[PDB]
Amino acid sequence: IDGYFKIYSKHTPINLVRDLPQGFSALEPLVDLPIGINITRFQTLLA
Amino acid sequence: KIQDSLSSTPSALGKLQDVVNQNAQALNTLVKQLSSNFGAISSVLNDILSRLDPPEAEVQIDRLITGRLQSLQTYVTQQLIRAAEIRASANLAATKMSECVLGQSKRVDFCGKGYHLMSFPQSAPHGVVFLHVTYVPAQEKNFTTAPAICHDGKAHFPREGVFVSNGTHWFVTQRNFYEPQIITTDNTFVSGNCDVVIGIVNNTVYDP
Amino acid sequence: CTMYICGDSTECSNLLLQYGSFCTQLNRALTGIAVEQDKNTQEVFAQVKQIYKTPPIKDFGGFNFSQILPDPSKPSKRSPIEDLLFNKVLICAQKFNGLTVLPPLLTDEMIAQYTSALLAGTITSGWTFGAGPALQIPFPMQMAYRFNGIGVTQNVLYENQKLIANQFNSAIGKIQDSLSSTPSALGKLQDVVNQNAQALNTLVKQLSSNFGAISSVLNDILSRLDPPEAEVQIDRLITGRLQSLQTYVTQQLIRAAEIRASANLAATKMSECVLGQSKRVDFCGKGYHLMSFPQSAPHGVVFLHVTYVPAQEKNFTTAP
Amino acid sequence: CTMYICGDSTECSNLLLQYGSFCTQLNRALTGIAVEQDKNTQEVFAQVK
Amino acid sequence: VNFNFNGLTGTGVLTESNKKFLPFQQFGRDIADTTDAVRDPQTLEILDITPCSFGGVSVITPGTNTSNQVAVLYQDVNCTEVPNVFQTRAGCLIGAEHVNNSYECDIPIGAGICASYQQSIIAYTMSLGAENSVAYSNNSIAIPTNFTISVTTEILPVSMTKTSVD
Ligand SMILES: *[C@@H]1O[C@H](CO)[C@@H](O)[C@H](O)[C@H]1NC(C)=O
Ligand SMILES: *[C@@H]1O[C@H](CO)[C@@H](O)[C@H](O)[C@H]1NC(C)=O
Ligand SMILES: *[C@@H]1O[C@H](CO)[C@@H](O)[C@H](O)[C@H]1NC(C)=O
Ligand SMILES: *[C@@H]1O[C@H](CO)[C@@H](O)[C@H](O)[C@H]1NC(C)=O
Ligand SMILES: *[C@@H]1O[C@H](CO)[C@@H](O)[C@H](O)[C@H]1NC(C)=O
Ligand SMILES: *[C@@H]1O[C@H](CO)[C@@H](O)[C@H](O)[C@H]1NC(C)=O
């Protein structure tokens, strides 16, 4: 958005086996990347 | 006292002097907005038309007219709210006129401070002055009371007044004026007996 | 107007002064409003010549009133149910933009003093204290006077006085429970406090409104614009913010007119329902009016109207 | 405000949004007026259970 | 002081804040959506920022027919910060001598203080209307004997100059 590539992350405990927990958390900003790119596609990297 | 107090004390008619003064200030204030610049090169309308030509004047004057129109609109709207307040006062004045002047009100402290008897209209500049004649208790006297009277075992209650504790000669008098009268069946009534009310002093009644 | 619109800016204040007397009529109007609240408050509560006090022994003819009258138990001279009303029903943040709140002439302790004195006056004097000097009178004969006034004979009161006292105390308990439990019960007062909170919060959000300007924040406008451009942008801000303040004041004048009508109604009810016995049916609450009780509230009054309401039905045949 | 002043126009409504809450207090006031007539009518006519 | 914190400008008094700001977040706002807290840009202390105390000034005076002595009201301004000074909830009133006698309100100040001219100008805790302990008891009745008739003038507006502004 508007010249920023903004990345958020959050680290919390979880206790579910197979689902998303109930409860609330907010993602804080880490760094503001000054890259004016057009991003429309992604792929997840696994090891 | 009204003649001397009003003749001496200028603020005695402050509620009317203030309403006339607020209308005078509203009009004088409106004139000061006619003397106000509002952002314009000049506040004087004759000077603006004498000063500017149509090709520049239409845009600059449209701006000046816009500002003066908001000022006049503000005057009229604010004047409408004040008029609503005078209108409400006028509704109060007309109601006060009809039931306090053209009648007798039983509403306590509605038509002046005291028990209202009558009012007299007086002409005033753009308003009315009411002379309210009211009954106001003055001197104090202490008495002992009782909730009811047990005469022959029946409980006697007053129709109109309150019992006075002379000390050996209890009397009943009208609520707003001490004038003791003998306790009789013509100014009291009998209903039920004295065995349930707490505090009856079982004094004597007369059967005229 | 000067501080709110051109806060801490001499150049902006001087530009605002080019609109003539708008600051003298808006400040005069708001001062008149503040004076109007001191006058209406003084009409409802400071309508009694002297401050009457109850005796240390609160023997009010078997009708307990320790619920509505102030308790020495609280450090404040406030009542317990009234304390519940006060607890149920930023000022720096408001002040910081020049929109301050003036203290009442009568403090909350002084409003409590008037409601205690006026309520004590009603209990000890009926209606005579509102028309002159206070007479002492016991409360059950006062009930007899008010029943006679409403066209109900005294014998019903005196024969069931213990039951009526129990019903009144239970009714007070019902008020305690209803107001503590039900939040919307105080909607008539919650709406006035809420309208004032919204009016000031709306006004500050209008201080956060841009109105067409390059920025809504006045300190940044003066820090960002030189007088040649600043004159146009500030004139835009003066028109928008001044019209917003004019709208605020207009809402306060119209709302004040409605509150004024309510205040005249409250003062009329105070005098005729509290300081007397009204014969106007359904004027002072639903039922036949006996008496009313003032209670202090934030910027307002709560009336406890004691009314006679028929319950059980019975059919009879009649004749003219 | 959107329909009357910027009727069926998103660009005009978006421009109108620059005046903050004037439409929330005008629509709130007029909604209060509508509620006000229902409240007054209910006091005058719906005064019987 | 007049402050400038990373572009945030204003005049006020700087105090220490106890808010737990997260590491990337630098300042806060109130319900009014105006700034009320700042992280100092050089040392990482959390500060609250408030403006300096101010308020209107009302002039307490007898009329010019009687005296030129006045008292000055700083409404909701603490005494200490001002440079017969009486501290009250409404503020510090300077030039009137505080007395212990309550009287009827003449020139109201606010928050329980009224002033009157008695001669000199005095400041006092307001009377709510003298004092009258009523001799109430469960068995005492008062009844007015002699009465007086008083006429009070109450003035109500009826009309206004009928202006018409074309
Ligand atoms: C009480 O009544 C008697 C009648 O015998 C009368 O003479 C007297 O003036 C009354 N008042 C007092 C205070 O005794
Ligand atoms: C009157 O009251 C007295 C109380 O001292 C009581 O002894 C007496 O029986 C009562 N008289 C009647 C007729 O009830
Ligand atoms: C006062 O009210 C309480 C209820 O909290 C009641 O128990 C008490 O009996 C009342 N006092 C009197 C003297 O009636
Ligand atoms: C004025 O300041 C002093 C200390 O700075 C404080 O103790 C006092 O309470 C303040 N006055 C008011 C009215 O808050
Ligand atoms: C006035 O009241 C204060 C506080 O009660 C007291 O300290 C003082 O001595 C009183 N008298 C005078 C003459 O100031
Ligand atoms: C009542 O008071 C008035 C004073 O206004 C006095 O002239 C009159 O004589 C008094 N009458 C009685 C009966 O005390």
PDB file of all heavy atoms in Angstrom, chain C residues 58 66 68-72 76-80 112 115-116 119:
ATOM      1  N   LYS C  58     -34.656  11.301  63.500  1.00  0.00           N
ATOM      2  CA  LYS C  58     -35.458  11.311  62.278  1.00  0.00           C
ATOM      3  C   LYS C  58     -36.730  10.488  62.475  1.00  0.00           C
ATOM      4  O   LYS C  58     -36.945   9.433  61.875  1.00  0.00           O
ATOM      5  CB  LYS C  58     -34.635  10.818  61.096  1.00  0.00           C
ATOM      6  CG  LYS C  58     -33.454  11.720  60.770  1.00  0.00           C
ATOM      7  CD  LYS C  58     -32.679  11.232  59.559  1.00  0.00           C
ATOM      8  CE  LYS C  58     -31.489  12.139  59.269  1.00  0.00           C
ATOM      9  NZ  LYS C  58     -30.375  12.000  60.244  1.00  0.00           N
ATOM     10  N   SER C  66     -34.707   8.026  55.552  1.00  0.00           N
ATOM     11  CA  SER C  66     -33.245   7.976  55.566  1.00  0.00           C
ATOM     12  C   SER C  66     -32.653   7.578  54.216  1.00  0.00           C
ATOM     13  O   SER C  66     -31.444   7.737  54.018  1.00  0.00           O
ATOM     14  CB  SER C  66     -32.763   7.000  56.640  1.00  0.00           C
ATOM     15  OG  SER C  66     -33.107   7.447  57.941  1.00  0.00           O
ATOM     16  N   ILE C  68     -33.783   8.913  51.215  1.00  0.00           N
ATOM     17  CA  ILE C  68     -33.778  10.047  50.297  1.00  0.00           C
ATOM     18  C   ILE C  68     -33.059  11.268  50.863  1.00  0.00           C
ATOM     19  O   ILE C  68     -32.633  12.135  50.085  1.00  0.00           O
ATOM     20  CB  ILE C  68     -35.213  10.447  49.908  1.00  0.00           C
ATOM     21  CG1 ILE C  68     -35.964  10.871  51.163  1.00  0.00           C
ATOM     22  CG2 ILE C  68     -35.934   9.304  49.211  1.00  0.00           C
ATOM     23  CD1 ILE C  68     -37.241  11.470  50.895  1.00  0.00           C
ATOM     24  N   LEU C  69     -32.919  11.362  52.136  1.00  0.00           N
ATOM     25  CA  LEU C  69     -32.285  12.442  52.865  1.00  0.00           C
ATOM     26  C   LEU C  69     -30.808  12.107  53.078  1.00  0.00           C
ATOM     27  O   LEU C  69     -30.446  10.928  53.136  1.00  0.00           O
ATOM     28  CB  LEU C  69     -32.995  12.634  54.200  1.00  0.00           C
ATOM     29  CG  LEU C  69     -32.851  13.862  55.091  1.00  0.00           C
ATOM     30  CD1 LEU C  69     -34.126  13.963  55.889  1.00  0.00           C
ATOM     31  CD2 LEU C  69     -31.657  13.793  56.014  1.00  0.00           C
ATOM     32  N   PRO C  70     -29.921  13.108  53.140  1.00  0.00           N
ATOM     33  CA  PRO C  70     -28.483  12.825  53.287  1.00  0.00           C
ATOM     34  C   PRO C  70     -28.150  12.068  54.569  1.00  0.00           C
ATOM     35  O   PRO C  70     -28.732  12.312  55.628  1.00  0.00           O
ATOM     36  CB  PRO C  70     -27.860  14.221  53.281  1.00  0.00           C
ATOM     37  CG  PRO C  70     -28.748  14.964  52.353  1.00  0.00           C
ATOM     38  CD  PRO C  70     -30.136  14.512  52.747  1.00  0.00           C
ATOM     39  N   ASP C  71     -27.192  11.140  54.464  1.00  0.00           N
ATOM     40  CA  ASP C  71     -26.718  10.395  55.626  1.00  0.00           C
ATOM     41  C   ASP C  71     -25.407  10.959  56.164  1.00  0.00           C
ATOM     42  O   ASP C  71     -24.451  11.159  55.399  1.00  0.00           O
ATOM     43  CB  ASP C  71     -26.619   8.883  55.352  1.00  0.00           C
ATOM     44  CG  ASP C  71     -25.686   8.491  54.203  1.00  0.00           C
ATOM     45  OD1 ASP C  71     -25.042   9.327  53.553  1.00  0.00           O
ATOM     46  OD2 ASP C  71     -25.597   7.271  53.949  1.00  0.00           O
ATOM     47  N   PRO C  72     -25.260  11.255  57.482  1.00  0.00           N
ATOM     48  CA  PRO C  72     -23.962  11.696  58.001  1.00  0.00           C
ATOM     49  C   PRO C  72     -22.928  10.585  57.777  1.00  0.00           C
ATOM     50  O   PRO C  72     -21.749  10.858  57.897  1.00  0.00           O
ATOM     51  CB  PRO C  72     -24.190  11.889  59.505  1.00  0.00           C
ATOM     52  CG  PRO C  72     -25.674  12.135  59.624  1.00  0.00           C
ATOM     53  CD  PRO C  72     -26.278  11.247  58.559  1.00  0.00           C
ATOM     54  N   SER C  76     -19.423  12.912  52.253  1.00  0.00           N
ATOM     55  CA  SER C  76     -20.228  13.955  51.570  1.00  0.00           C
ATOM     56  C   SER C  76     -21.609  13.978  52.220  1.00  0.00           C
ATOM     57  O   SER C  76     -22.057  12.911  52.676  1.00  0.00           O
ATOM     58  CB  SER C  76     -20.334  13.662  50.100  1.00  0.00           C
ATOM     59  OG  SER C  76     -20.767  12.327  49.884  1.00  0.00           O
ATOM     60  N   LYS C  77     -22.273  15.133  52.250  1.00  0.00           N
ATOM     61  CA  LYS C  77     -23.659  15.139  52.782  1.00  0.00           C
ATOM     62  C   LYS C  77     -24.570  14.692  51.642  1.00  0.00           C
ATOM     63  O   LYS C  77     -25.329  15.529  51.126  1.00  0.00           O
ATOM     64  CB  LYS C  77     -24.026  16.511  53.349  1.00  0.00           C
ATOM     65  CG  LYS C  77     -23.992  16.606  54.869  1.00  0.00           C
ATOM     66  CD  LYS C  77     -23.917  15.254  55.550  1.00  0.00           C
ATOM     67  CE  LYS C  77     -22.661  15.071  56.376  1.00  0.00           C
ATOM     68  NZ  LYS C  77     -21.867  13.909  55.915  1.00  0.00           N
ATOM     69  N   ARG C  78     -24.487  13.413  51.276  1.00  0.00           N
ATOM     70  CA  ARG C  78     -25.274  12.880  50.137  1.00  0.00           C
ATOM     71  C   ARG C  78     -26.134  11.737  50.674  1.00  0.00           C
ATOM     72  O   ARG C  78     -25.762  11.177  51.713  1.00  0.00           O
ATOM     73  CB  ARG C  78     -24.289  12.421  49.057  1.00  0.00           C
ATOM     74  CG  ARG C  78     -24.909  11.742  47.846  1.00  0.00           C
ATOM     75  CD  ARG C  78     -24.198  12.139  46.568  1.00  0.00           C
ATOM     76  NE  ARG C  78     -23.484  13.398  46.724  1.00  0.00           N
ATOM     77  CZ  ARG C  78     -23.893  14.560  46.230  1.00  0.00           C
ATOM     78  NH1 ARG C  78     -25.020  14.629  45.544  1.00  0.00           N
ATOM     79  NH2 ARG C  78     -23.174  15.651  46.428  1.00  0.00           N
ATOM     80  N   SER C  79     -27.245  11.422  50.009  1.00  0.00           N
ATOM     81  CA  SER C  79     -28.136  10.358  50.442  1.00  0.00           C
ATOM     82  C   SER C  79     -27.635   9.017  49.899  1.00  0.00           C
ATOM     83  O   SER C  79     -26.834   9.006  48.968  1.00  0.00           O
ATOM     84  CB  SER C  79     -29.525  10.702  49.901  1.00  0.00           C
ATOM     85  OG  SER C  79     -30.566   9.864  50.303  1.00  0.00           O
ATOM     86  N   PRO C  80     -28.051   7.816  50.447  1.00  0.00           N
ATOM     87  CA  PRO C  80     -27.639   6.580  49.765  1.00  0.00           C
ATOM     88  C   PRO C  80     -28.304   6.279  48.418  1.00  0.00           C
ATOM     89  O   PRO C  80     -27.582   5.936  47.474  1.00  0.00           O
ATOM     90  CB  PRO C  80     -27.840   5.509  50.851  1.00  0.00           C
ATOM     91  CG  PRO C  80     -28.803   6.092  51.827  1.00  0.00           C
ATOM     92  CD  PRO C  80     -29.172   7.446  51.331  1.00  0.00           C
ATOM     93  N   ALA C 112     -26.745  19.288  46.996  1.00  0.00           N
ATOM     94  CA  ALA C 112     -27.195  18.404  48.060  1.00  0.00           C
ATOM     95  C   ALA C 112     -27.772  19.200  49.222  1.00  0.00           C
ATOM     96  O   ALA C 112     -28.763  18.785  49.826  1.00  0.00           O
ATOM     97  CB  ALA C 112     -26.042  17.520  48.531  1.00  0.00           C
ATOM     98  N   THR C 115     -31.210  20.368  48.020  1.00  0.00           N
ATOM     99  CA  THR C 115     -32.193  19.298  47.960  1.00  0.00           C
ATOM    100  C   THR C 115     -32.532  18.795  49.353  1.00  0.00           C
ATOM    101  O   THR C 115     -33.700  18.523  49.631  1.00  0.00           O
ATOM    102  CB  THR C 115     -31.693  18.148  47.086  1.00  0.00           C
ATOM    103  OG1 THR C 115     -30.434  17.676  47.586  1.00  0.00           O
ATOM    104  CG2 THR C 115     -31.553  18.589  45.636  1.00  0.00           C
ATOM    105  N   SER C 116     -31.555  18.766  50.261  1.00  0.00           N
ATOM    106  CA  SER C 116     -31.833  18.410  51.645  1.00  0.00           C
ATOM    107  C   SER C 116     -32.693  19.460  52.332  1.00  0.00           C
ATOM    108  O   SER C 116     -33.667  19.116  53.003  1.00  0.00           O
ATOM    109  CB  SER C 116     -30.525  18.215  52.409  1.00  0.00           C
ATOM    110  OG  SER C 116     -30.772  17.853  53.756  1.00  0.00           O
ATOM    111  N   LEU C 119     -36.216  19.495  50.570  1.00  0.00           N
ATOM    112  CA  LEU C 119     -36.928  18.269  50.883  1.00  0.00           C
ATOM    113  C   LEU C 119     -37.344  18.267  52.349  1.00  0.00           C
ATOM    114  O   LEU C 119     -38.474  17.884  52.684  1.00  0.00           O
ATOM    115  CB  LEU C 119     -36.008  17.102  50.510  1.00  0.00           C
ATOM    116  CG  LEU C 119     -36.320  15.623  50.338  1.00  0.00           C
ATOM    117  CD1 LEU C 119     -35.139  14.981  49.651  1.00  0.00           C
ATOM    118  CD2 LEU C 119     -36.476  14.986  51.666  1.00  0.00           C
TER     119      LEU C 119
END
